[PDB]
């Protein structure tokens, strides 16, 4: 009992927008209510979304825009739709608090159907919005369908898209249908069918093959793509998720339509022969058809196509299974995709011999069979090209005129991609880590029991002698346990009384540190409070599980005492051009001897693009972050800040283009000291002097670059290049760091904040993040770096929310790291110390009653400082609506100042320790994390899980569960689902907003064209060198250190696109 | 101050008593039977006060009470059940009252005497067993003459 | 028995707690000397404290509960209902400042938190405002309690303080500090005898000056007042 008509939607997130958490839970409700949803994923330009909606011929478009620039974005979309015959398509949007009420009325007046505010979500409910959205789009599109083939044959691609909607719904006239097939027969165009097991890579391989067709033929071929995905007959609609993988279909000569099976069993649409015939008549040079996930004994694609391609993975079980696969009997080509998997080699020999048997070609070699080993995930894979070369030769004989190719006409059947991030030998590394931790705890129990018994014996021995009756038999049992105790454990208890005397006085001699802060009442508040246990069993147990701050396993902190002047405060900042943000840096770091900066970039920079005039982009420039496009911008950004100063640290949050941005920063830090030398000597440094300066800067420069790509796929969606390429370059950075002894900069901030804000609960966040971190460790170990060479360069980033588990999140992360790094990886002390930054949860703050947010941000900031974090960011009260205003950032900055200076309990540095609740929670969370390690481990590790979309799957599930409750009421949210204002207005008056000036946008454009003109000679040359660095497989970052001096951010990114590929979205 | 002096003394006794009987069981586990230990243990059973001895005695029964998902206590002829568990979005069980995990009976008694659970002497952690559910937020009013203050009272408390 | 005004006048947490328990015990002695039974007036005695930023405030309530329970049992031999000290806590109004009134909600939150952690019986929250108690100002104050009680995670546990090394040590320190102040009042002739000399008034006045001094001295940081001031005024 769904909608009346076949209702179809196109859903996506706006250009340079990673916020998919919102749009993902909407396409879920859409699908459940019975709508076919063509999901495009995040980061989609208007040109993309509109082209998609027009080819799919949908009734509705749903867009999420959280980056701002939404007014220009939707206006552009509305305009582009009307211009190209899509005026009847309704457009829906949402951006939470970012899209203020005024902009909603404006956009809805412009043409937008409806934009939903957080207040709309509260009144209508989650299902209520989608019901409203669906009921609007419940219209019959068959009226717009052509009645004659004149339009379609002429080349009208919109008429074709509508004729298909007519044919699919069976509302096409019988005389028109037969007339279509009659001209389809005379058309004589080849139809390639691509079938195979579920998730084998049919879509990914199709996309890659199309790319080959374009590069080989200079985009001279008109290709029609018909992808089919299975439709769940329960709901009514389906999740057509093939288009999301297609990156090479964005071109006028390419057309793609997504069909639902609309049957629970068959892997083909009941109108597929009609749809194919429609494309043949539209004078396409080639028609490619992808089926759904088919069983082994399925082959329904064969009679409808002229050529068939079976796609499989090396995992098919026994070799005897291949005799059951009906498709191996009909397939003209077999592609064993995912050839990077274990057993791919042997898999090819089985399939080859099986195809040879099925064809009875005994007089042929098994290696000559049309069985190919491909790796579609790998950019420019030679395997895929080999398959392409084969398909061309086959299509050539079947009447398809094509020019002599421009591609490497290579030979062979098997890919030669020998790259590996984590060797299959180490596949269960996460499971081993879990064992290491659990093993450690088992020892604590055992050693404690021994230490306890040992004390109890010698205690009774002294008591017997005090009465007279002596028994040296007791002492024999005691000395027996002296040996049973380990060497390390025995010394722990031995140093305990000496340890107590240390933390007892008014100072701590090592270097001297004060231990006492005195209250107005005259009470001495010790910085570190030690337990008063008498039982040596409890002493050892405590010393092993939670030693004092600055001692293994560093549960209560990695350092002995907190910094004296340098508070952990580090405020996220970024707005407008580099000039304006440079003022905000000075505002935040005003009155502080220690300059701790945190930079936020606009959505355009976050995606490695230069600012441009197109409304897609222009509207987003300088919004939601500082616009940085050239090295000259980067220099302006940190002017007045000595980057090489020991008390100055810069944290720049960037992911996709992180290596490019990092090179700009390093160049900035270097150039600063060159300028400082030039002033202190009134002359340029010699070639030798500069070399000494440059080398020194790299060693002492202190800061952090996020760059965590594993969390990009899982959480933030800022991965622009291919996933594997990013990890490749990320290692290049760490290798560069080691060679130049860059020991003060963090090469990667292994994060979970983003995973959490997407919806993941604290356990999931912590588990995934530690897992990602351990993955990098395994990756760099397999890559030949000493554990003590990169482990001290690893920074972490977490989120603190309202959930109980957040209170002990940090301490758990510290212990799991310390224990594993010591026992498992055998690293040194500096490596066992996990340092992390905590930012208060932004999703925990709301647009309704924005004054309440300061209360939540306070509580979150408190448990962060209690749990001895290394760096803290505080969110503003207008968090849901805008980037922090000048007045807003002070209230956020005051929260830390009040807790650190005024708050009494905070005068103690380990207030958590001892608490029954904290220790129990710490143990629970730890084990919960370990169990999640094991779940990921049995999915093939972090990478293996990402392949399935396990993390993304679980995050989105948890996000829905939370959101279902927030609107429900079961989970109380003050001022939102309970304790509403009797007025009913969320920030009734006009609040000030942080947007970018028009002059600022024009400034960036003029600076860019000026920068480009300056290095116009060396630009093309440098970029060519950069691509050759990727081809010859050298160090990419090492070239970037030179590239950012003559090239802009966009220039570098697009250059890498030609050689590093683009990210393939993962739903 | 006198009370605290007793806590120290009774703890030392409770600790020694445990240490003796502990060593007694360990000697018998090796073969050696020295009942001289037991004589010193029984000597401290009398040294412990009546109130203190029962505190340690009810400790294991106390642990079982705060362990389950509910807290059963029979007043009058009926009973009063109270939930102990609140579950988080992650699925973690957060107990309303968290008990210590000491093995040393010296620490157990010391804790039971200085800071018992909420609703038990000396009520350090609160005078009631569990917090009220729901609130005694009084309705304050007082301005003008008795008539005006009354109307506010009637209006607010409607 | 209240002590809100004593603290609000300038008394530090130790002085407030000590004086208040002393006053309470005075009423007890006063009623007993009328030949009355302890179990007839003790259970009804209510207490009223202030919570500020000082470390001692975190354990103020639990100390008051133990000192009462132990003395009522051992010294006065009263029953269970009498040994239970029930009290109301109201966040410190003195700590609320005119300058940067938005900051006050931060301080009132922290003070409300340790009150609920330490299992108080009644809590009043102060507004961010100076001006009249607006219906909007009272909602922000009322939201602080609602958020902690309903949203805050740690608060789902009713004894989170217990076990903490800092809390237990602070509890012991404050307790003894209070006991010593009892002795100081006792050698001045009891609470009444001290009031005759103006001992309490004298000491409160001294502590108020000392506070107001370090505040101006710049030694006791107050965000938005003596440091991190409003860049315009
Ligand atoms: C979660 C989040 C993130 C997560 C995103 C996780 C993910 N995978 O989606 C992370 C941490 C990665 C993130 C990162 C960034 N973010 Co962010 N983020 C938020 C946050 C906290 C909440 C957004 C959210 O997911 N809400 C959950 C949804 C379900 O609820 P809701 O928004 O209230 O929406 C309701 C209705 O409006 C309706 N609705 C909303 N959308 C839609 C869509 C449709 C189709 C329909 C029918 C209905 C509908 O549904 C809901 C019903 O209750 C907001 C602040 C806030 N609290 O609003 C900032 C915020 C949106 N982000 C912001 C910024 C600046 C960024 C960054 C660019 C920062 C930087 N410079 O690096 C990055 C980069 C993002 C990127 N990679 O492109 C700013 C935006 C500034 C602006 N536009 O003026 C915000 C406002 C925070 C702030 N105040 O600074 N972000
Ligand atoms: N390890 C590996 N993964 C691949 C390869 N090709 C595609 N994938 C991944 O497999 C998943 C499913 O791909 P998809 O194209 O949708 O397969 P389909 O559903 O059968 O069409 C995605 O995560 C892809 O990135 C490959 O050659 N190797
Ligand atoms: C993703 C999270 O990043 C923070 N955030 C995003 N952009 C900015 C900015 N310019 N300034 C401060 N905080 C910011 C918010 O707290 C948001 O929730
Ligand atoms: Mg597919
Ligand atoms: Mg498919």
* DSSP letter string, A228-271: EE-B-TTTS-B---SGGG-SS--STTEEEEEEE--SSS-SS-TT
Tokens of A363: 């007089």
Query: How many C-beta atoms lie closer than 10 Å to residue A273's C-beta?
Result: 15
A572 lines ligand 3 (CB under 6 A): yes
Question: Is the CA virtual torsion A889, A890, A892, A896 positive or negative?
Answer: positive
Distance CA A753, CA A767 (A): 12
Our CA-based measurement puts residue C157 at a distance from the nearest CA of chain B, in whole angstroms, of: 4
| Distance between B78 CA and the closest CA of chain A, angstroms | 31
Domain that holds residue A387: 143-398
Q: Answer yes or no: are the C-beta atoms of A439 and A822 closer than 8 Å.
A: no
B78 Cβ contact list (under 8 Å, min separation 6): none
Going by alpha carbons, the residue nearest to atom 75 of ligand 1 is A18
Pairing of strands A871-873, B70-73: unpaired
Residue A238: which of A75, A27, A424, A500 has the closest Cα? A27
Contacts of A1041 (CB under 8 A, 6+ apart): A663, A666, A667, A736
Ligand 2, pocket residues at CB < 6 Å? A 198-204, 242, 245, 337-338, 340-341, 375-377, 947, 1064, 1066
Which residue, by CA, sits nearest to atom 3 of ligand 3?
A: A842
DSSP bridge pairs for A569: A872
How many C-beta atoms surround the C-beta of residue A909 within 10 A?
26
CATH at A300:
3.40.50.300
Q: What is the rounded distance in angstroms from the CA atom of residue A252 to the CA atom of residue C17?
A: 81
DSSP code for A551: S
Cβ atoms of residues A44 and A74 within 8 Å:
no
Q: How far apart, in whole angstroms, are the C-alpha atoms of residue C39 and residue C41?
A: 6
d(CA C229, CA C233): 8
* Angle, CA A1007 vertex, CA A1004 and CA A1009 arms, to 5°: 110
Non-local (6+) Cβ contacts of C7 within 8 A are: C13, C15, C16, C49, C50, C52, C92, C94
C171 at interface of B, judged by CB pairs closer than 8 A: yes
Q: Which residue of C has its CA nearest to B137?
A: C122
Q: Which two tokens stand for residue B11?
A: 């703890």
Check: CB of residue A124 under 8 Å from CB of residue A115: no
Please report the resolution in angstroms.
Answer: 3.3
**Which are the contacts of A603, defined by CB distance < 8 A and separation ≥ 6?**
A15, A16, A17, A67, A68, A69, A620, A623, A624, A625
In this structure, what token pair is assigned to residue A825?
A: 């990886």
Of A521, A532, A807, the CB nearest to C153: A807
Indicate which of B16, B36, B38, B89 best probes the interface with A, i.e. most A CBs within 10 Å of its own CB.
B89
Contacts of B among chains (3+ CB pairs under 8 A): A, C
Query: Probe ligand 2: pick from A196, A204, A386, A951, max atoms within 8 Å of CB?
Result: A204
Between the CA of residue A619 and those of A198, A373, A576, A603, A957, what are the distances in Å?
A: 41, 45, 12, 10, 33
Coil vs helix vs strand at A839: strand
Q: By the CB < 8 Å criterion, does C162 face chain A?
A: yes
CA of A230 to the centre of ligand 2 (A): 17
Q: How many CA atoms lie within 13 A of C51 on its CB side?
A: 30
Give the CB-side neighbour count of residue A416, counting CA atoms within 13 A. 7
Count chain A–chain B contacts defined by CB atoms under 8 A.
105
Pairing mode, strands C46-51 and C86-91: parallel
Technique employed here was X-ray
Interface contact A804-C100, CB threshold 8 A: no
Closest residue of chain A to B27, computed from CA coordinates:
A474
A24, two tokens: 């993902």
Instruction: Kindly report the protein residue whose alpha carbon is nearest to atom 16 of ligand 3.
Output: A842
A352 vs A356: CA distance, rounded Å: 6
Chain A residues with CB-CB distance to C167 below 8 A: 911, 914-915
Place of tokens 């120290």: B8
User: Any alpha helices (H) in A682-790, and if so which ranges?
Assistant: 687-700, 710-711, 723-739, 753-757, 762-781, 787-790
Do residues A986 and A850 make contact, with C-beta atoms less than 8 angstroms apart? yes
Please give the Cα distance from B64 to C171 (Å, whole number): 28
Tell me the three-class secondary structure of A552-604, residue by residue: CCCCCCCCCCCCCCCCCECCEECCCCHHHHHHHHHHHCCCCCCEEEEEEECHH
Token pair 């409890």 in the structure block, residue: A538
Report the candidate in A916, A923, A952, A752 with the shortest Cα–Cα distance to residue B92: A923
Nearest in space to C62 (alpha carbons), one of A370, B125, B104: B125
Residues from chain C contacting residue B117 (CB–CB below 8 Å): 159
Question: How many angstroms separate the CA atoms of A8 and A56, rounded?
Answer: 8
- Cβ distance A920 to B16 less than 8 Å, yes or no, reads no
What element of type H or E holds A800? strand A794-800
What atom of ligand 2 comes closest to residue A200's alpha carbon? 20
Alpha helices in C93-189 (DSSP H): 104-117, 137-146, 165-186
Cα dihedral C68, C74, C75, C76 sign:
positive
Burial degree of A1016 (CB within 10 A; 0-12, 13-18, 19+): exposed
Element (H, E) at A286: strand A286-290
Q: How far apart are CA A1008 and CA A998, in angstroms?
A: 16
Q: Is the CB of A121 under 6 A from ligand 1?
A: yes
Cross-chain Cβ contact A805/B90 below 8 Å = yes
Block residue for tokens 């340029």: A684
Q: Which ligand is nearest to the CA of A67?
A: 1
Closest Cα partner for A909 from A918, A900, A917? A900
For strand A871-873 and strand A572-573, is the pairing parallel, antiparallel, or unpaired?
unpaired
Which atom of ligand 3 is nearest to A875's Cα?
16
Q: Does the beta-carbon distance from C162 to B94 stay under 8 Å?
A: no
């Amino acid at each position: 009992r769904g909608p009346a008509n076949k209702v179809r939607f196109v859903t996506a997130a706006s250009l340079f927008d990673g916020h998919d958490a919102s749009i993902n839970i909407m396409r879920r409700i859409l699908q459940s209510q019975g709508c076919e949803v063509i999901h495009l994923g995040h980061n989609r330009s208007v040109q993309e979304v509109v082209t998609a909606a027009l080819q799919e011929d949908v009734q509705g478009i749903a867009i999420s825009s959280y980056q701002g620039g939404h007014v220009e974005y939707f206006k552009y979309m509305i305009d582009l739709l009307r211009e190209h015959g899509g005026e009847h398509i309704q457009v829906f949007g949402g951006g939470g608090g970012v899209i203020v009420p005024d902009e909603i009325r404006e956009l809805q007046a412009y043409g937008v159907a409806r934009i939903y505010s957080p207040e709309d979500g509260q009144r209508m409910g989650l299902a209520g919005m989608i019901t409203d959205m669906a009921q609007r789009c419940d219209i019959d599109l068959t009226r717009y369908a052509p009645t004659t083939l004149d339009t379609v044959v002429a080349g009208d691609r919109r008429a074709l898209a509508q004729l298909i909607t007519a044919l699919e719904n069976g509302k096409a006239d019988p005389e028109l249908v037969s007339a279509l097939h009659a001209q389809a027969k005379a058309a004589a165009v080849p139809v390639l069918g691509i079938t195979g097991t579920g998730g084998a890579g049919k879509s990914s391989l199709t996309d890659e093959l199309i790319r080959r067709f374009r590069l080989d033929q200079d985009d001279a071929l008109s290709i029609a793509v018909i992808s089919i995905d299975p439709s769940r007959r329960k709901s009514g609609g389906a999740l057509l998720g093939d288009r999301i993988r297609m990156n090479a279909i964005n071109h006028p000569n390419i057309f793609m339509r997504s069909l639902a099976t609309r049957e629970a069993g068959s892997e083909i649409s009941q109108a597929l022969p009609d749809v194919i015939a429609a494309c043949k008549a539209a004078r396409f040079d080639l028609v490619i058809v992808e089926t759904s996930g088919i069983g082994q004994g399925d082959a329904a694609i064969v009679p409808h196509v002229d050529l068939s391609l079976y796609v499989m993975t090396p995992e098919f079980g026994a070799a005897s299974q291949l005799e059951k696969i009906d498709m191996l009997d009909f397939a003209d080509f077999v592609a064993i995709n995912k050839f990077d998997r274990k057993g791919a080699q042997d898999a090819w020999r089985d399939v080859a011999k099986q195809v040879q048997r099925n064809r009875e070609q005994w007089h042929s070699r098994a290696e000559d069979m049309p069985v190919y080993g491909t790796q579609a995930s790998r950019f420019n894979d030679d395997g895929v090209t080999m398959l392409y070369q084969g398909l061309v030769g086959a299509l050539g004989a079947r009447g398809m005129s094509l020019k002599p190719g421009t591609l490497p006409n290579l030979e062979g059947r098997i890919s030669t991609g020998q790259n590996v991030i984590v060797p299959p030998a180490r596949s269960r590394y996460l499971a081993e880590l879990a064992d290491t931790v659990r093993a450690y705890h088992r020892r604590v129990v055992a050693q404690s029991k021994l230490a306890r018994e040992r004390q109890q014996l010698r205690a009774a021995h002294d008591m017997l002698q005090g009465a007279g009756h002596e028994s040296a038999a007791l002492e024999t049992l005691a000395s027996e346990r002296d040996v049973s105790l380990g060497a390390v454990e025995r010394k722990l208890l031995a140093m305990w009384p000496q340890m107590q005397q240390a933390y007892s006085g008014d100072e701590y001699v090592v270097i001297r540190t004060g231990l006492i802060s005195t209250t107005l009442s005259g009470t001495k508040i010790r910085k570190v409070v030690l337990p008063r246990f008498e039982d040596e069993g409890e002493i050892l147990k405590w010393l092993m599980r939670e030693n004092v701050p600055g001692s293994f396993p560093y549960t209560a902190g990695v350092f002995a005492f907190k910094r004296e002047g340098e508070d952990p405060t580090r405020m996220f900042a970024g707005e407008g051009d580099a000039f304006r943000t440079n003022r905000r840096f000075k505002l935040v770091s005003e009155g502080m001897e220690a300059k701790r900066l945190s930079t936020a970039f606009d959505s355009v920079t976050l995606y490695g693009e230069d600012p441009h005039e197109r409304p897609d982009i222009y509207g987003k420039v300088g919004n939601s972050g500082v616009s940085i496009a050239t090295l000259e911008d980067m220099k302006v950004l940190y002017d007045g800040f000595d980057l090489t100063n020991p008390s100055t640290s810069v944290s720049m949050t960037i992911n996709g283009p992180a290596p490019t941005i990092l090179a700009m920063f390093m160049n900035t830090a270097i150039d600063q000291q060159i300028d400082r030398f030039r002033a202190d000597n009134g002359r340029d440094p010699t070639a030798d002097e500069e070399a000494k300066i440059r080398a020194w800067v790299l060693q002492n420069v202190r800061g952090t670059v996020q760059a965590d790509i594993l969390k990009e796929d899982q959480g933030q969606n800022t991965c622009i290049f291919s996933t594997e390429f990013s990890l490749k370059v990320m290692g290049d950075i760490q290798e560069y760091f080691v060679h130049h002894q860059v020991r003060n900069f963090y090469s990667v901030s292994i994060s979970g904040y983003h995973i959490a804000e997407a919806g993941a609960n604290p356990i999931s966040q912590l588990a995934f993040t530690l897992a990602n971190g351990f993955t990098y460790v395994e990756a760099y170990l397999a890559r030949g770096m000493h554990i003590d060479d990169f482990a001290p360069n690893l920074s972490f980033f977490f989120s603190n929310g309202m959930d109980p588990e957040y209170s002990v999140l940090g301490r758990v992360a510290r212990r799991i790291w310390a224990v594993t790094m010591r026992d498992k990886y055998g690293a040194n002390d500096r490596s066992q110390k996990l340092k992390y930054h905590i930012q208060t949860s932004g999703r925990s703050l709301h647009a309704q009653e924005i004054d309440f947010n300061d209360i939540r941000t306070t509580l979150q900031a408190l448990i962060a400082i209690y749990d001895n974090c290394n760096s803290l960011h505080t969110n503003a009260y207008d968090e849901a609506i805008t980037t922090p205003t000048a007045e807003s950032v002070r209230r956020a900055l005051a929260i830390q100042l009040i807790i650190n200076r005024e708050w009494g309990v905070a005068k103690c540095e380990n207030p958590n320790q001892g608490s029954f609740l904290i220790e129990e929670l710490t143990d629970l969370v730890e084990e919960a994390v370990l169990q999640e390690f094991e779940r990921i481990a049995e999915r093939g590790g972090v990478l293996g899980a990402m392949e399935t979309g396990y993390q993304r799957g679980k995050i989105q599930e948890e996000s829905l569960y939370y959101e279902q409750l927030k609107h429900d009421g079961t989970l109380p949210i003050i001022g939102v689902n309970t304790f509403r204002n009797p007025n009913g207005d969320p920030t009734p008056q006009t609040l000030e907003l942080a947007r970018s000036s028009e002059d600022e946008k024009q400034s960036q454009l003029h600076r860019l064209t000026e920068f480009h003109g300056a290095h116009q000679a060396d630009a093309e040359a440098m970029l060519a060198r950069l691509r050759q660095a990727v081809i010859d497989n050298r160090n990419v970052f090492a070239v970037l250190m030179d590239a950012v001096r003559v090239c802009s951010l966009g220039q570098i990114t697009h250059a890498l696109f030609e050689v590093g590929g683009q990210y393939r979205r993962n739903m | 101050r006198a009370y605290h002096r007793r806590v120290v003394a009774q703890s030392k006794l409770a600790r020694e008593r445990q240490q003796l009987r502990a060593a007694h069981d360990m000697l018998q586990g090796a073969g050696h039977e020295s009942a001289a230990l037991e004589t010193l243990a029984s000597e401290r059973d009398v040294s412990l006060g009546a109130v203190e001895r029962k505190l340690l005695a009810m400790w294991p029964q106390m642990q079982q009470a705060y362990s389950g998902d509910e807290y059963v206590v029979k007043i009058r002829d009926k009973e009063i059940r109270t939930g102990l568990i609140s579950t988080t979005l992650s699925g973690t069980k957060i107990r309303k009252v968290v008990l210590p995990r000491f093995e040393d009976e010296g620490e157990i008694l010391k804790w039971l005497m200085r800071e018992n659970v909420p609703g038990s002497f000396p009520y350090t952690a609160g005078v009631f067993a569990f917090k009220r559910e729901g609130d005694p937020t009084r309705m304050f009013a007082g301005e003008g003459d008795a008539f005006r203050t009354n109307r506010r009272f009637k209006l607010v408390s409607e």
